[PDB]
Nucleic acid binder design. Structure first.
Ligand code: PAR
Ligand code: PAR
Ligand code: PAR
Ligand code: PAR
Ligand code: PAR
Ligand code: PAR
Ligand code: PAR
Ligand code: PAR
Ligand code: PAR
Ligand code: PAR
Ligand code: MG
Ligand code: MG
Ligand code: MG
Ligand code: MG
Ligand code: MG
Ligand code: MG
Ligand code: MG
Ligand code: MG
Ligand code: MG
Ligand code: MG
Ligand code: MG
Ligand code: MG
Ligand code: MG
Ligand code: MG
Ligand code: MG
Ligand code: MG
Ligand code: MG
Ligand code: MG
Ligand code: MG
Ligand code: MG
Ligand code: MG
Ligand code: MG
Ligand code: MG
Ligand code: MG
Ligand code: MG
Ligand code: MG
Ligand code: MG
Ligand code: MG
Ligand code: MG
Ligand code: MG
Ligand code: MG
Ligand code: MG
Ligand code: MG
Ligand code: MG
Ligand code: MG
Ligand code: MG
Ligand code: MG
Ligand code: MG
Ligand code: MG
Ligand code: MG
Ligand code: MG
Ligand code: MG
Ligand code: MG
Ligand code: MG
Ligand code: MG
Ligand code: MG
Ligand code: MG
Ligand code: MG
Ligand code: MG
Ligand code: MG
Ligand code: MG
Ligand code: MG
Ligand code: MG
Ligand code: MG
Ligand code: MG
Ligand code: MG
Ligand code: MG
Ligand code: MG
Ligand code: MG
Ligand code: MG
Ligand code: MG
Ligand code: MG
Ligand code: MG
Ligand code: MG
Ligand code: MG
Ligand code: MG
Ligand code: MG
Ligand code: MG
Ligand code: MG
Ligand code: MG
Ligand code: MG
Ligand code: MG
Ligand code: MG
Ligand code: ZN
Ligand code: ZN
Lengths: 112, 77, 63, 249, 50, 91
RNA sequence: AAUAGGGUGAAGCCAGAGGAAACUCUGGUGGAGGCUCGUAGCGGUUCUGACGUGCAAAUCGAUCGUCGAAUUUGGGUAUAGG
RNA sequence: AGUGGGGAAAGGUUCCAUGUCAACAGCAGUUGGACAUGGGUUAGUCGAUCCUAAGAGAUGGGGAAGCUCCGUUUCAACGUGCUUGAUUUUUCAGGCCAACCAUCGAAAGGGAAUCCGGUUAAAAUUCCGGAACUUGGAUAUGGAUUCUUCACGGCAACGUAACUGAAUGUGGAGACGUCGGCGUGAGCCCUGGGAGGAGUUAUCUUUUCUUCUUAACAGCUUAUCACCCUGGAAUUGGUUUAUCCGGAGAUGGGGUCUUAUGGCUGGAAGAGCGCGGUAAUUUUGCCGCGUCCGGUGCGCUUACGACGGUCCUUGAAAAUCCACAGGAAGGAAUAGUUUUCAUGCCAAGUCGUACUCAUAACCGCAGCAGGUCUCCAAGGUUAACAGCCUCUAGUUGAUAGAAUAAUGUAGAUAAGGGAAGUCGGCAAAAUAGAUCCGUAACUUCGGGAUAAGGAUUGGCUCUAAGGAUCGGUUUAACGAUCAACUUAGAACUGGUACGGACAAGGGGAAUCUGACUGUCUAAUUAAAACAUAGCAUUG
């Protein structure tokens, strides 16, 4: 079987010197240098992978359109759907309870 | 190279201001179960991309050939 | 010509074996092969209605 | 003779601490107006392992009172502190596990950790896993508090000095044997170059005061004066006593 | 190595140019005493120092 | 079947290190690899990360604990002492 | 950055049996370990072998220790003559 | 696991062509890594350059007689700051910030972007041909959007060609250890039909070997995991090789998303490959045909995916890019906005690039049996990348001829005895793979153990056992098709041979000693020495 060589001066199996083996239109077998696999965008609240956002190596995000980098919602590309839902409910319940705690201490500023 | 499928889209593209030349390639093929048919590929070379239109009908190809702008240089292969 | 001889069973006697029983045919592979056969049939019977989900669950743990 | 292993450590060439993997310095907040007069609330985001430390560390986010920003502090995690817990720090903070209070605000018998030697030094005492400081009593006229340290020593600190309510997490680590040289190797791989240790009696007289002899033996008393000089202080330095510890101390 | 600096490669160009034989018309000058280049260097025998 | 009469998890250590060292190891190594009840979600899904760090797989709550158990006896006592001193101080 | 192919079979898990209970037994599964046979690697026991104006200012041959970790190793970097 | 094909370090012209034999190639020499003359290394995409690592190191300062030492934001008034509307008044008006911020330090870390065919005597991811990509800059057309000004749809996960967003703030990516099995892909290996070419052909062989390939890039499509809607569960169900999940919503039904991977197509047959017919000293060709359709798997290598274990060990940083929160400012109707949608225009400087990488291009004084980091990896036998034979590729190099005394060096064999030799079983011999049976004292219960001790093993012809995919009132308990080598047994057979070469434990009973794994006297000592966990004392 035919054997391959590195295409660059780096002779070592490092993380950035990974190769694939590809068959050419000439019926030959050469090494083709691969780029590092992209990592998934992750949630800032729960750490889960965000759905609907392309997984690319960071510089490749600047030259691609916005629909790939976001979701049509609050905190679209930053927080997951479930984490925004808890934020909304928590914000609402907590702001509502602040009113109960306020009125209760105006009622005690006239009876105590 | 990008492929174009709609013939109407292809002729308007062939009159874009950056189109230098065109290639018409004829491939002799066979309809699998059927018999020999002559495929024709129209290739328009633009500034960024090469655009290919595949026309499997040998007669609509001839009509398309007379539908291209006369100014484009066409190479027959 | 050997491959037909070995497919017919030739050259496989005790005097022709150098690896252990488990290197030649791992018991972990045989177990995995068997338990996938049993699991595949049980889902076929339950999904065809030949057995119900209660007999299925008991036999799944027995397999 | 030669410079002995005691003396080569001060130069700190191969004897510096291995700190690549450390997760930050564990400190209390800088004592500010909010902690001096009231309390401030932060939320625990992480409880993480710090290499070279038996105690886990907690990352606690507070709001900055003066500019729009989040401030992340590295506290020593007390046992029972959980992710998402609200931590209250200040004079008016309540007596709950994990809260940071002045020493005068804690009643007698309060178990507190990461205690300040001096008001605002951000934690000096009782920082290792399973250790803590017990508050024995108060002297309100001079504003001072007496506490008992993990070594058993009693100390008097300003009552304005702060501490963290609870016991430092990760205790009981010493209860399990290491069982292997490799375990100590991995232990010190992220601490410093102090292992393994060659016995001075197994060296030559150039290398150590214990070196030499046609048998391995020290030859003179191994209790060394406190006033001895560098190169001599190898053994039991300023030893008040020797031998098996019998009875109470 | 194949990967070399400019400062190195410039020294190697001078080392090649200094490794000529003596030009033969020099022996014809009057009161000429130089018969050959006495500062020859072979790559395997004597090393440069770069 | 029952594979070992008494070594249990320390059967990975063979005959080395001494029986005394191995049985003392067994107690704390059973404790550090166990699953504990989550005080937040109620499942028995709390396991140790590094020493002193105990995470729950279900609700993703991390709690600071002991080296080999989620709670040491000393910490549990301090909570009740703190609970007690908090009640009198707050009346 | 590197480390063939085998052996053993620790926790956890499944099924069955016995027992009043506390529990025990059996058959599997699983794949632990500064575990093991053994290449490469790393090392260097014996022949007190060869050689001993040598291939070699330390090698050669067989034999041998270890071979998943306190492992082997490149480069960068730190420590300098009492 | 090469005497193959490349590289890093190091060398420096050794590379290629021509000539050539005085010296060198420990014989020779018409030959050479020698000698002489010329030629040769082409980059926006490959590395440097940028980033930071351990560390190095200026500055304000503080020491020091001083050479200098310390310190790295340090008891410092630390921006050669930016962003706009501009102004054409080359002045300004101001608006924001300045925790941290000199710098050097990686051709293996991080990192914007290129592929195929062809081409030289010698260069090529650099040249030619074709087809792309990134960054920076400029910029028009189309599209999009607005009279409900800064878009619509979907219950939702989210979808869309686009579809304002200052200061300031928050996240993500960059970004990472190790082991185990499972699954999937790719390349390789194996193999069928068919279309070509070569070899054998006394005889047999529908035979043996060989060609049948498809790059970067673009479009459409393709998913485990995760998530959404519905629904409400014991007769508990679902489920992995490996036991975990579910009233904190399972099973069931229907959907959303993510790189990876496959498919179709463009690139692209025009290329390359295999044949047939020709032109001709002939630069170089010209013509015609084919290049198609499959199968298989505990296979090998490697990538990815979903998982499980592990640690008193929890397994870099920074440059850089994106998103979100926020709501400053600016925005239409006779017209307004935006270059995150498509298309179009311009540019990408500097240095390295030949060749050797070793039993002859490096270091060991040398063309030295030594040393020196790494990538790819065919067939048979086999557990095996071992050993042995072979394909591709590469070598056939080592002064040679004639003889074959003693004594050697390396290697074989030996009657009967079997350690009597000797300090001593030194050396050699014996054992050796695999299946089945069987296995003691002692023990920290884990071991000891391959303990010991026995049997078997070839070839051939058979027998039996173990699956996959489809097809429907639950006798599918069956049919159809397809498919891998594993295990057990029998008969026959032979100069009783058979792990037939290769490969490959001798075993047992004890004493002294160190617990163990581990470590050292490079170049006479590997040990009982050192270390170690454990124990104890001291500050
Ligand atoms: N050409 C295939 C794929 O097409 C992509 O093109 C798509 C992307 O530009 C964008 O894709 C969207 C995107 O908004 C975001 N990633 C989410 C969404 N799921 C994707 O969706 C798209 O891809 C899926 C998958 O094939 C299709 O089934 C679907 O029809 C299509 N809308 O919209 C395009 C429509 O297909 C990539 N440009 C290309 O690199 C990739 O190969
Ligand atoms: N009471 C003061 C205590 O100092 C303690 O520690 C102090 C010191 O022991 C410690 O030493 C630091 C050293 O780490 C780091 N290199 C910074 C500093 N130069 C040293 O400080 C030292 O040197 C200074 C001279 O500079 C002298 O005052 C003294 O020798 C000593 N404080 O740094 C601290 C001060 O910088 C604790 N931080 C805390 O208990 C408290 O602040
Ligand atoms: N890095 C400076 C810090 O401050 C101190 O540093 C010490 C030094 O600055 C200085 O110590 C000197 C030392 O310079 C010198 N080279 C050796 C001398 N033995 C030390 O002296 C010290 O120890 C001795 C012995 O117990 C006492 O008798 C003496 O009082 C004490 N000053 O004084 C300090 C001790 O008093 C702390 N030891 C320690 O936190 C750290 O070194
Ligand atoms: N001179 C006698 C023989 O040569 C040997 O020399 C060693 C090497 O020079 C020789 O080459 C090895 C081998 O794996 C193979 N045949 C080629 C491979 N490139 C080399 O492998 C290795 O070489 C050196 C030295 O071992 C290593 O340090 C390095 O990591 C690695 N490249 O293999 C030997 C080791 O197996 C030894 N001196 C001796 O043990 C052996 O019997
Ligand atoms: N919500 C969690 C986040 O955790 C953050 O804390 C972490 C981050 O600041 C930083 O984490 C980095 C991250 O910044 C960066 N974008 C890369 C990666 N996502 C993280 O990586 C972290 O976790 C991975 C897990 O395998 C480890 O390999 C890595 O060593 C570790 N730093 O290191 C911290 C410790 O892991 C912050 N507290 C905050 O952003 C937020 O709370
Ligand atoms: N331009 C940047 C690059 O874009 C790439 O984009 C690739 C993807 O968008 C898309 O890849 C598709 C993939 O979506 C789909 N699920 C499978 C399909 N086979 C792939 O196709 C691609 O990759 C395969 C190899 O797997 C090639 O054989 C094929 O020629 C190529 N078009 O086609 C593009 C081919 O370049 C990659 N994301 C990555 O290499 C990188 O980001
Ligand atoms: N494939 C499974 C999935 O993919 C991921 O998992 C991938 C890896 O992260 C994971 O690796 C192992 C894991 O198996 C094991 N049970 C725990 C272990 N800590 C992980 O290791 C990890 O730790 C380091 C920390 O520095 C990470 O940086 C790194 O991602 C990974 N090596 O194994 C997977 C390899 O295919 C995610 N962890 C998660 O979504 C899920 O497990
Ligand atoms: N542009 C060439 C690049 O810079 C350098 O080349 C430049 C220098 O050699 C030289 O620069 C001189 C400078 O030496 C001298 N001391 C001052 C003079 N003004 C410079 O001149 C140059 O630089 C100025 C800016 O300073 C430019 O405005 C001007 O256009 C340019 N000629 O002029 C060259 C043109 O820029 C490198 N030598 C070259 O290899 C590299 O490609
Ligand atoms: N059984 C293992 C095999 O033994 C083989 O070896 C066999 C023969 O080579 C070996 O012969 C050896 C001889 O080589 C060696 N130099 C000396 C010895 N006297 C001979 O031994 C033989 O003769 C003696 C006569 O008394 C008898 O015991 C018997 O016939 C036999 N062992 O006897 C062995 C059989 O007993 C091979 N080494 C190899 O294939 C494999 O190891
Ligand atoms: N499992 C052992 C099996 O034995 C087989 O053969 C064995 C038997 O089948 C056979 O024995 C047969 C016996 O069955 C039958 N009743 C009588 C016959 N004479 C024997 O055979 C014998 O004699 C014949 C000549 O007749 C010779 O081939 C030879 O001496 C011997 N095989 O000979 C072997 C005696 O044990 C194969 N040899 C072997 O490959 C296979 O593994
Ligand atoms: Mg890796
Ligand atoms: Mg095209
Ligand atoms: Mg058989
Ligand atoms: Mg098993
Ligand atoms: Mg010691
Ligand atoms: Mg000694
Ligand atoms: Mg002395
Ligand atoms: Mg003395
Ligand atoms: Mg002595
Ligand atoms: Mg001695
Ligand atoms: Mg002693
Ligand atoms: Mg005496
Ligand atoms: Mg006592
Ligand atoms: Mg040399
Ligand atoms: Mg010199
Ligand atoms: Mg193994
Ligand atoms: Mg071992
Ligand atoms: Mg071993
Ligand atoms: Mg070793
Ligand atoms: Mg030797
Ligand atoms: Mg000798
Ligand atoms: Mg001699
Ligand atoms: Mg060996
Ligand atoms: Mg080094
Ligand atoms: Mg001296
Ligand atoms: Mg081999
Ligand atoms: Mg030459
Ligand atoms: Mg000669
Ligand atoms: Mg001669
Ligand atoms: Mg020359
Ligand atoms: Mg690049
Ligand atoms: Mg530059
Ligand atoms: Mg630094
Ligand atoms: Mg300095
Ligand atoms: Mg100065
Ligand atoms: Mg500098
Ligand atoms: Mg730099
Ligand atoms: Mg440097
Ligand atoms: Mg680099
Ligand atoms: Mg061509
Ligand atoms: Mg080419
Ligand atoms: Mg070449
Ligand atoms: Mg080109
Ligand atoms: Mg729209
Ligand atoms: Mg990294
Ligand atoms: Mg692995
Ligand atoms: Mg794996
Ligand atoms: Mg695979
Ligand atoms: Mg590419
Ligand atoms: Mg895949
Ligand atoms: Mg926003
Ligand atoms: Mg080259
Ligand atoms: Mg040599
Ligand atoms: Mg060799
Ligand atoms: Mg020299
Ligand atoms: Mg010779
Ligand atoms: Mg001769
Ligand atoms: Mg012989
Ligand atoms: Mg005899
Ligand atoms: Mg006889
Ligand atoms: Mg006898
Ligand atoms: Mg005798
Ligand atoms: Mg012997
Ligand atoms: Mg046996
Ligand atoms: Mg024994
Ligand atoms: Mg004795
Ligand atoms: Mg020992
Ligand atoms: Mg003892
Ligand atoms: Mg020695
Ligand atoms: Mg030894
Ligand atoms: Mg020795
Ligand atoms: Mg010792
Ligand atoms: Mg004490
Ligand atoms: Zn979330
Ligand atoms: Zn929980």
């Amino acid at each position: 079987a035919q054997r391959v060589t590195y295409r660059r001066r780096n002779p070592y199996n490092t993380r950035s010197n990974k190769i694939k083996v590809v068959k050419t239109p000439g019926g030959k077998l050469v090494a083709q240098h691969v780029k590092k696999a992209a990592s998934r965008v992750k949630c800032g609240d729960c750490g889960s992978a965000l759905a609907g956002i392309s997984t690319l190596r960071p510089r490749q995000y600047a030259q691609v359109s916005k629909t790939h980098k976001t979701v049509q919602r609050a905190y679209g590309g930053s927080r997951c759907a479930n984490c925004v839902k808890e934020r909304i409910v928590r914000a609402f319940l907590i702001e509502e309870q602040k009113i109960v705690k306020r009125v209760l201490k105006e009622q005690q500023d006239k009876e105590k | 190279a990008r492929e174009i499928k709609d013939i109407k889209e292809f002729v308007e593209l062939a009159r874009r201001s950056d189109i230098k030349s065109a290639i018409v390639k004829v491939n002799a093929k066979v309809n699998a179960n059927g018999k020999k048919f002559k495929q024709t590929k129209f290739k328009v070379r633009g500034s960024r991309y090469q655009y290919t239109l595949v026309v499997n009908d040998a007669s609509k190809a001839k009509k398309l050939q007379q539908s291209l702008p006369p100014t484009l240089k066409i190479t027959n292969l | 010509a050997l491959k037909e001889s070995k497919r017919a069973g030739r050259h496989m006697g005790y005097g022709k074996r150098k690896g252990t029983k488990d290197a030649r045919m791992p018991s972990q592979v045989l177990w995995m092969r068997r338990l996938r056969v049993l699991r595949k049939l049980l889902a076929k019977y339950r999904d065809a209605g030949k057995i119900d989900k209660h007999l299925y669950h008991n036999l799944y743990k027995a397999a | 003779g030669r410079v002995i292993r005691n003396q080569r450590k001060g130069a700190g060439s191969i004897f510096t601490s291995h700190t690549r993997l450390r997760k930050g310095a564990a400190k209390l907040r800088t004592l500010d107006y909010a902690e001096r007069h009231g309390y401030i609330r932060g939320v625990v985001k992480q409880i993480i392992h710090d290499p070279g430390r038996g105690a886990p560390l907690a990352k606690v986010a507070f709001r900055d009172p003066y500019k729009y920003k989040l401030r992340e502090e590295t506290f020593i995690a007390n046992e029972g502190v959980y992710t998402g817990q609200f931590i209250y720090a200040g004079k008016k903070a309540s007596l709950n596990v994990g809260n940071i209070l002045p020493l005068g605000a804690c009643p007698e018998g309060t178990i507190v950790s990461n205690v300040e030697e001096k008001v605002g030094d951000r934690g000096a005492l009782g920082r290792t896993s399973g250790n803590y400081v017990i508050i024995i009593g108060h002297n309100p006229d001079e504003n001072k508090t007496r506490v008992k340290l993990p070594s058993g020593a009693k100390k008097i600190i300003s009552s304005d000095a702060r501490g963290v309510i609870g016991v430092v997490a990760g205790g009981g680590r010493i209860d399990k044997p290491l069982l292997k040289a490799g375990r100590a190797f991995h232990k010190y791989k992220v601490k410093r170059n102090s292992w393994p240790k060659t016995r001075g009696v197994a060296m030559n007289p150039v290398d150590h005061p214990h070196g030499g002899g046609n048998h391995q033996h020290i030859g003179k008393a191994s209790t060394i004066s406190r006033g001895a000089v560098s190169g001599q202080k190898a053994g039991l330095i300023a030893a008040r006593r020797t031998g098996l510890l019998r009875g109470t101390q | 190595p194949s990967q070399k600096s400019f400062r190195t490669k410039q020294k190697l160009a001078k080392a090649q140019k200094q490794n000529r034989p003596l030009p033969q018309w020099i022996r014809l000058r009057t009161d000429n005493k130089i018969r050959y280049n006495a500062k020859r260097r072979h790559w395997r025998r004597t090393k440069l120092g770069i | 079947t029952k594979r070992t009469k008494k070594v249990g998890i320390t059967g990975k250590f063979g005959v080395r290190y001494g029986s005394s060292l191995r049985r003392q190891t067994k107690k704390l190594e059973v404790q550090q690899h166990a699953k504990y009840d989550c005080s937040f979600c109620g499942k028995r899904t709390v396991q140790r990360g590094a020493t002193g760090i105990w995470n729950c797989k279900s609700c993703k709550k991390t709690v600071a604990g002991g080296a080999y158990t989620v709670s040491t006896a000393a910490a549990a006592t301090v909570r009740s002492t703190i609970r007690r001193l908090r009640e009198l101080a707050e009346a």
